[PDB]
Design an enzyme around this catalytic site. Structure first.
Site, PDB file in Angstrom:
ATOM      1  CB  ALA A  18     -34.540  14.911 101.468  1.00  0.00           C
ATOM      2  CG  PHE A  19     -31.049  12.027  97.827  1.00  0.00           C
ATOM      3  CD1 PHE A  19     -30.406  10.791  97.889  1.00  0.00           C
ATOM      4  CD2 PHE A  19     -30.411  13.142  98.373  1.00  0.00           C
ATOM      5  CE1 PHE A  19     -29.159  10.670  98.495  1.00  0.00           C
ATOM      6  CE2 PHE A  19     -29.169  13.027  98.979  1.00  0.00           C
ATOM      7  CZ  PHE A  19     -28.543  11.790  99.045  1.00  0.00           C
ATOM      8  CE  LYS A  26     -33.894   7.852  95.356  1.00  0.00           C
ATOM      9  NZ  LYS A  26     -34.995   8.561  94.662  1.00  0.00           N
ATOM     10  CG  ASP A  59     -36.334  18.945  92.678  1.00  0.00           C
ATOM     11  OD1 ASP A  59     -35.907  20.083  92.972  1.00  0.00           O
ATOM     12  OD2 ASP A  59     -36.200  17.972  93.455  1.00  0.00           O
ATOM     13  CB  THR A  87     -29.833   5.215 101.526  1.00  0.00           C
ATOM     14  OG1 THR A  87     -30.681   5.640 102.603  1.00  0.00           O
ATOM     15  CG2 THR A  87     -28.412   4.988 102.053  1.00  0.00           C
ATOM     16  CG  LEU A  99     -21.757   6.015  96.265  1.00  0.00           C
ATOM     17  CD1 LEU A  99     -22.334   5.911  94.862  1.00  0.00           C
ATOM     18  CD2 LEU A  99     -20.282   6.395  96.207  1.00  0.00           C
ATOM     19  N   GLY A 100     -24.133   8.119  99.712  1.00  0.00           N
ATOM     20  CA  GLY A 100     -24.834   9.232 100.357  1.00  0.00           C
ATOM     21  C   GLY A 100     -26.112   8.858 101.082  1.00  0.00           C
TER      22      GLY A 100
HETATM   23  C1  LIG Z   1     -26.190  12.083  96.708  1.00  0.00           C
HETATM   24  C2  LIG Z   1     -24.699  12.029  96.309  1.00  0.00           C
HETATM   25  C3  LIG Z   1     -23.877  11.650  97.552  1.00  0.00           C
HETATM   26  O1  LIG Z   1     -24.322  13.332  95.859  1.00  0.00           O
HETATM   27  C4  LIG Z   1     -24.610  11.074  95.103  1.00  0.00           C
HETATM   28  N1  LIG Z   1     -23.395  10.432  94.537  1.00  0.00           N
HETATM   29  C5  LIG Z   1     -23.546   9.639  93.415  1.00  0.00           C
HETATM   30  N2  LIG Z   1     -24.768   9.416  92.774  1.00  0.00           N
HETATM   31  C6  LIG Z   1     -25.010   8.634  91.685  1.00  0.00           C
HETATM   32  O2  LIG Z   1     -24.094   8.063  91.112  1.00  0.00           O
HETATM   33  C7  LIG Z   1     -26.403   8.578  91.124  1.00  0.00           C
HETATM   34  C8  LIG Z   1     -26.637   8.004  89.861  1.00  0.00           C
HETATM   35  C9  LIG Z   1     -27.917   8.007  89.324  1.00  0.00           C
HETATM   36  N3  LIG Z   1     -28.929   8.576  89.961  1.00  0.00           N
HETATM   37  C10 LIG Z   1     -28.797   9.164  91.155  1.00  0.00           C
HETATM   38  C11 LIG Z   1     -29.992   9.800  91.823  1.00  0.00           C
HETATM   39  C12 LIG Z   1     -31.293   9.558  91.337  1.00  0.00           C
HETATM   40  C13 LIG Z   1     -32.399  10.143  91.933  1.00  0.00           C
HETATM   41  C14 LIG Z   1     -32.251  10.993  93.017  1.00  0.00           C
HETATM   42  C15 LIG Z   1     -30.984  11.258  93.512  1.00  0.00           C
HETATM   43  C16 LIG Z   1     -29.867  10.681  92.927  1.00  0.00           C
HETATM   44  C17 LIG Z   1     -27.519   9.186  91.747  1.00  0.00           C
HETATM   45  N4  LIG Z   1     -22.401   9.142  93.053  1.00  0.00           N
HETATM   46  C18 LIG Z   1     -21.432   9.562  93.889  1.00  0.00           C
HETATM   47  C19 LIG Z   1     -20.055   9.298  93.904  1.00  0.00           C
HETATM   48  C20 LIG Z   1     -19.252   9.856  94.874  1.00  0.00           C
HETATM   49  C21 LIG Z   1     -19.812  10.681  95.841  1.00  0.00           C
HETATM   50  C22 LIG Z   1     -21.172  10.944  95.838  1.00  0.00           C
HETATM   51  C23 LIG Z   1     -22.027  10.399  94.866  1.00  0.00           C
END
Ligand SMILES: CC(C)(O)Cn1c(NC(=O)c2ccnc(-c3ccccc3)c2)nc2ccccc21
Length: 301
Positions: free
Chosen positions: A29-30, A52, A142, A32, A25-26
């Site tokens: 710095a946070f 994560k 943050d 992967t 998904l991404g």
């Molecule tokens: C970082 C990004 C790419 O923007 C995250 N991204 C996510 N992310 C989570 O679903 C999630 C859930 C729960 N916690 C986190 C967390 C926790 C700590 C520090 C950073 C992220 C993250 N879902 C997506 C779906 C489609 C496109 C991008 C998505």
């Protein structure tokens, strides 16, 4: 006890065999983050999850486990909870999937379909999430639009507890006393809440764009704040301005922000002026999807 109450949260440990990784998904710095499905071994349940992983060492493992401690300890509809952890070579945090990504990216990509009702409802929901963290005596440290995630366009939650504590840094979201003196309170989170609202109301504009981070403290000392967004009435902008006071106690509490934004959310077009606000609609509720259950409906005894 003599001090804080005992933290009786359950840290659940999950097997590698219990969950699939579907895609990435991404990456930043946070860390992967991967899209996945968690299938508890003895249950007809499939749970969409974010997994994560760090970007292995003792420093990395200690810091990511501190974040897992804090996430496992929280339980609120507007806060992202940890489902569990997995102890492979690399420690993996398994979280609830937020399918629509972070709110900052969402407001940028859907600017021409975001109405006043959504924006003000999001402000309410963030304030509730933060007020809950204040009840648990937790300073987020943050809060920004990048760290608010979207479960559905109607439902957002606060995430990223990698700097969260009991009562390269993001200078442009921090209060003055945090920058100058490293002082962090729930009221310093209110300053950041103000900046977060300003991000949303400008549809994800970068705050103090062009001004470098070293200029920010003296700029704020002189009395210069972020400007009034075009869509913001004075009512909404005043509330942002109150979050950015020098006197920390003179700023609003999160409970008052819940109240004020929820009053405004009852008559949204009185408080935010957006061209063509009436006709806008955002989405509302391959894989064998029959036994899929969202983590919020999957409750541990
Ligand atoms: C970082 C990004 C790419 O923007 C995250 N991204 C996510 N992310 C989570 O679903 C999630 C859930 C729960 N916690 C986190 C967390 C926790 C700590 C520090 C950073 C992220 C993250 N879902 C997506 C779906 C489609 C496109 C991008 C998505």
């Amino acid at each position: 006890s003599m001090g804080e109450a005992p933290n009786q949260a359950l840290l659940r440990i999950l097997k590698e065999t219990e969950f699939k990784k579907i895609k990435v998904l991404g990456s930043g710095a946070f860390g992967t983050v991967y899209k996945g499905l968690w299938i508890p071994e003895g249950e007809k349940v499939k749970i969409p999850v974010a997994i994560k992983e760090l970007r292995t060492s003792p420093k990395a493992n200690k810091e990511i486990l501190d974040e897992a401690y804090v996430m496992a300890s929280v339980d609120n509809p507007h806060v992202c909870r940890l489902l569990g952890i997995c102890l492979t070579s690399t420690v993996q945090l398994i979280m609830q999937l937020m399918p629509f990504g972070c709110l900052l990216d969402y407001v940028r990509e859907h600017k021409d379909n975001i109405g006043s009702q959504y924006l003000l409802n999001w402000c309410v929901q963030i304030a509730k999430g933060m007020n809950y963290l204040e009840d648990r005596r937790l300073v987020h440290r943050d809060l920004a639009a990048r760290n608010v995630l979207v479960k559905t366009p109607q439902h957002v939650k606060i995430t990223d507890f990698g700097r969260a504590k009991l009562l390269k840094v993001p200078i442009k979201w921090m209060a003055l006393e945090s920058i100058l003196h490293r002082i962090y309170t729930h009221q310093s989170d209110v300053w950041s809440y103000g900046v977060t609202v300003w991000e949303l109301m400008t549809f994800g504009s970068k705050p103090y764009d062009g001004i470098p981070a070293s200029e920010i403290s003296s700029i704020l000392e002189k009395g210069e704040r972020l400007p009034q967004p075009p869509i913001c009435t004075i009512d909404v902008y005043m509330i942002m301005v109150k979050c950015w006071m020098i006197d920390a106690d003179s700023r609003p509490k999160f409970r008052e922000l819940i109240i004020e934004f929820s009053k405004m959310a009852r008559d949204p077009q009185r408080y935010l002026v957006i061209q063509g606000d009436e006709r806008m609609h955002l989405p509302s509720p391959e894989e064998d999807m029959d036994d899929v259950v969202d983590a919020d409906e999957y409750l541990i005894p």
